[PDB]
Symmetry: D2
């Protein structure tokens, strides 16, 4: 299963890192017109958040060699011009942030990609969250898909379990969210979203979250019943969901823990984790899960009204999910 | 007004700063055995968060002189030993953190203080939120009172306006909270609350909030119906309350804004503010309000289930309320 | 004295703010094609580092009105097309960062600007530091000038005084420098300067400084005798120079203090300041000086070998110098 | 070689971590009266800077079990009372910060420790830097020794090499230094050093460095010829030395690189490293070296005047050096 990456950014590079833990999946090609070959090596090798790459790297014969595997590197702006088929790239991760519609992402099909995975929500491409709705993937009616957002991959598995066991009548969520590449170091222009221009390191910044719309798609039963927002805050990675909902079936906090824990050991294993330790955000740097339920941080007001808390490494967990989605799609 | 301050910490220094903008009140004495006179002047003239003092400062003949007013300074460990009476301190602000029950706070009365205001919640002393339960002050029964906490002073005025009009059935809140002096620069010991020992600048840290208990005392109609939690995040000041409640009477967000905006203009003026701009947390550094409702940031899921957002300068807003309370306590 | 601003960025906006403390200077026009009129008001009104604007602002009849003064606003990309003469703009501050050569900056002369000030070093335009070489400004031969860089405006006045009184045989400097708009929030592409792409908030980052080349231009006698570098560190503003030099004339630290202090009270007044207080970087947020000598932080190894320390608000001090340079140029 | 640790702080815990990579050394006992047994496990297991511990941990029968090795845990305030001999602890790392003199540290000898290593400079105990002066350790008349400071372990090996090959006539250094446990989250009291009280995350803070005095002890030939200072800046770990010196023997930058590189591969291997990559501070999180020379960051003004740059993980490198010093002392 041969993979191409468009945009060698935070997500692109960490998809690359994650792919090395999946023996079936092999990245064969990467495209980024703002990062030439030798610079790709540097950016892959040193990471401020996740530390130095532990394997080997080399630039050789115009190719990026990672753990002995040669990777083709391109510097093209128009994704329709990337020669994926020539490089062997069946599946393409679209992770630039700027080709999120089906029309735009479909450009990778012109270069001979079979399937495109948009590493972000889409206005029209079908969205998926591993552990929640991947069964609805139709191989041969869908070609361009989305892996939703990081917040959607945290919220959806938790929401599924709470809804399946107890029924969410209504709910609202907040993510306390790490700053990202779209934000600014000091107050600068962000013409569409004014607050997102304000210095990331100085500010708690209210913002939209992709999970607000996406959660209703990935779990149809919850559309109109569950939405939310984000505050961008000054940590470079790791985020946390704060889900407040009224329940249909009255319950206790102990039973909530029991079902979530059991899901973490069985059907959602690898996606949903469970902890009872006294954790903070830096404890999830380079965690591979989509959602880590924090038992101690939750609050139960009464039998039908609760606040649940779940951590996610917004970079690393999501990147591992992109790879799981590829492997799941390839087994058809 | 005449006021004495015990403890020249964050709240003590900024109550002193706020007192100079209130012409009713004048601080005449300060006690702290861990800050000598020249160091008190330094600590008062320079502030990393609120900037340099804009008046004049001087040390002269053993007094600290701020805009020409001499202030006597003591270095006493036992509050019973502070001679408030021999400097004319009618109202004493207890802002050390270690004299929070009425028995210990009462020690200032034994040194000629007539009324004592604890700048923190108390287990037994009556708590007050300006603009919520301030008239429940009884100038015949209560010689030591508490001004609750910053987060309480932000949540209580927003809760009152929403409850009085739309009756809050159930509600849960989060405050995204600036780190404080009780936190650590790097991972260090915090034997009672493990999460609070972890590096403040590196971490989003779940924690308890003083408003969880206090809000039920300052608004008894809301006791068993409203609680919440905090997340400590890496900003040095300014916090934001995230309140999600189900309502009794259905409404629209534009009607939510209507009642908040004109409660802002009438009975809660100076305490609850209202804005429609695209603000971020540093826009409230040195703001004087208890609670600034963020119109654009709120979310309405359905006519009876809503998420409200309100900012507060946890240092400066609370300090102006301590002084506003001294005036309200006086004046009878 | 009527001023136009090209690029409403950190420096452009703070030049605007600073101009309001100079009653002779009036900004009549601003050009930025990435910030429309209503957004200009927002970005001017709120500042994460320098706090809210204290005067009045309004958008009216397609103009930005600041303290009652209407300002014409343009959204043109090619500076040759900005109609400065129509707006009354005699002097134009070129503060976009992309028109730093004489040829490019000269475009504002079409559009009938009389003089252009490049808010950054130039490869060929003559550079100036107020208090150091402004006498060399020839108003009949130089229509495009540069105000050097922030670090050059800190280092040059100090260096002048030390060189004039003691002789710098050789010297090297470091600036511990706030991060700027050119840096990234998380590790991203910075193709020419790889270290500058690494997350600004996580990293101490070695970098070039404009003072390395510029100081030899503004003080010819020191060319080849004085250079240096920078470390970008995680504060949003305020920087500090660490100047290490061997001296020709042997001296003592007390005499160094005396000459610097005297210069701060006389010939370099307003540009070079002198303090003996126990200051830190946040104490200079919104300071107007080019260079604040820190007496206590210095070290004298022996009579001819010293380390001097000088603070600067890299945003605000430099912005005030741009305005002083305009006023100085206008008085011809 | 059996080791006891007094004070389970940053250095104590990371000495513990480092000891696990040294097969000869086994920590058998730990004392800290402010961190009980179960809390020790928590604090060891999660670390905001260095990530989760990768081995196993357990509390059993009143002992801390790390990778199957049981560790005796004590909660005693007076080091004279710790029964090291009972636990088998030959060598004791004194890492509390408060028993740094020979008289005080000698208290561990009463409990049956053979040797004490003070994890900090001492006014009178002999100081050592591995790779520089460990030959001067006399296992005949030296039971209490010091491993100097982190900055001294960075500076001394570099200085040795430059002095040995070229001669340092005179020099001054700066360390741009991570904030530490002694600093404050927000502006608080620090009565002896007023700047160290100012909020660590908001400020670049001038400070003293232990290397200023210590370097003259560990390299007698350089006493009076080399001193310096620090700026504390907002990163949680990793620091960097900026060494400016005049040389006796004229040289070129290429030859400086060649000697440092050669030293890094031979006599100073493991202590002094050499890189030519475009590194930043986060690239050295959990690096084990005392000093990593940054070839690209250096500047040569002229053949006898240079600025050299060397990184160090102030926590982890120093901790590994404490263990190397133990193993070196145990051989004898
Ligand atoms: N990092 C997160 O927290 C996170 C989590 C979930 C989803 N996402 C989503 O993943 C996507 C990538 O985000 P990121 O954080 O990696 O941003 P990033 O800035 O790190 O990566 C974007 C990369 O794409 C490249 N690029 C831009 N335009 C291009 C073009 N036309 N052709 C080829 N390459 C191009 C850039 O050089 C850059 O390297 C975004 O849509 C984002 O919303 C991010
Ligand atoms: N800081 C906030 O954001 C905030 C908000 C609301 C309420 N409060 C409450 O206000 C109180 C003070 O908080 P702060 O932030 O000013 O803390 P702080 O630690 O900055 O101030 C405490 C001061 O008290 C002094 N002190 C300690 N023991 C003393 C004693 N025995 N006698 C006299 N002085 C003594 C200390 O030296 C220090 O200067 C706490 O109870 C806190 O919970 C704080
Ligand atoms: N901020 C500092 O610390 C500092 C100090 C000294 C010098 N400078 C210099 O001042 C200049 C501006 O720096 P800044 O910090 O304000 O950066 P910035 O990114 O905040 O400002 C640049 C502004 O110019 C605008 N712009 C870009 N291209 C344009 C064009 N063709 N026409 C009109 N506007 C355009 C952008 O929209 C932006 O608002 C730079 O050259 C910088 O080197 C900055
Ligand atoms: N972190 C660094 O950058 C660094 C580098 C080199 C050296 N050091 C030095 O190492 C020493 C320890 O530093 P740290 O970073 O571990 O500080 P820390 O504050 O993290 O740890 C100190 C520990 O000692 C304990 N302690 C206090 N009093 C005690 C007593 N009477 N008995 C037993 N234990 C007691 C504390 O509870 C704490 O756990 C300091 O002297 C410091 O100067 C630190």
């Amino acid at each position: 299963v041969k993979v191409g990456i468009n945009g060698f950014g935070r997500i692109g590079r960490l998809v690359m890192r994650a792919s090395l833990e999946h023996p079936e999946v092999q990245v064969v090609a990467v495209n980024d017109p703002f990062i030439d070959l030798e610079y790709m090596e540097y950016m892959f090798k040193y990471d401020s958040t996740h530390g130095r790459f532990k394997g080997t790297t080399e630039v050789k014969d115009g190719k990026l060699v990672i753990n002995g595997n040669p990777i083709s590197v391109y510097a093209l702006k128009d994704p329709a011009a990337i020669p994926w088929k020539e490089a062997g790239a069946d599946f393409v991760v679209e992770s630039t942030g700027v080709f999120t519609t089906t029309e735009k992402a479909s450009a990778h099909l012109h270069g001979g990609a079979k399937k495109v995975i948009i590493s972000a929500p889409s206005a029209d491409a079908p969205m998926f969250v591993m552990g929640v709705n991947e069964k609805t993937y139709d191989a041969a009616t869908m070609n361009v898909v989305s892996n939703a957002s990081c917040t959607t991959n945290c919220l959806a598995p938790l929401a599924k379990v709470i809804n399946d066991n107890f029924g969410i009548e209504e709910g609202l969520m907040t993510t306390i969210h790490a700053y990202t590449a779209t934000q600014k170091t000091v107050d600068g222009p962000s013409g569409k979203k004014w607050r997102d221009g304000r210095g990331a390191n100085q500010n708690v910044i209210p913002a939209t979250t992709g999970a607000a719309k996406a959660v209703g798609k990935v779990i149809p039963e919850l559309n109109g019943k569950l939405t939310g927002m984000a505050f961008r805050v000054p940590v470079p990675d790791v985020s946390v969901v704060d889900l407040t909902c009224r329940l249909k079936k009255p319950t206790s906090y102990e039973e909530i823990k029991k079902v979530v824990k059991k899901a973490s050991e069985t059907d959602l294993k690898g996606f949903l984790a469970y902890t009872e330790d006294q954790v903070v955000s830096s404890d999830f740097i380079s965690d591979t899960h989509s959602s880590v339920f924090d038992a101690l941080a939750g609050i139960q007001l009464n039998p039908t009204f609760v606040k649940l808390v779940s951590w996610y490494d917004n970079e690393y967990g999501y990147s591992h999910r992109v790879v799981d989605l590829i492997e799941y799609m390839a087994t058809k």
